[PDB]
Amino acid sequence: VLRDNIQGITKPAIRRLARRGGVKRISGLIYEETRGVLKVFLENVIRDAVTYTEHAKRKTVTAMDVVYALKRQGRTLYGFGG
Template sequence: AIRRLARRGGVKRISGLIYEETRGVVTYTEHAKRKTVTSLDVVYALKRQGRT
């Protein structure tokens, strides 16, 4: 499903590390009862993983 989302967004190749990060982002989006991933979802998910 993550690969399908990326393809829809125009991504051709996907790093293996992306999957875990994307799961965190989707968790934030689903919790907010939204279907659109926002940039803040990404920021919060990465911050939670200690990446920024």
């Protein structure tokens, strides 16, 4: 059972992802906040993708099922079929 890899998204990774977002200064305690946001977003999309996966009687999560899982939530994704 994999455990405690929310620390895997490390502090300079969040730094780079915020610099792509156009930041100048990072709050020292915003890292946990962004981690929680990524948890809730990935939990929603992975729940939807797994529920797609269970309907196909499959036990592997497919990028195709992920794409429709994303575009049900209002955010379509390109580059992996449609």
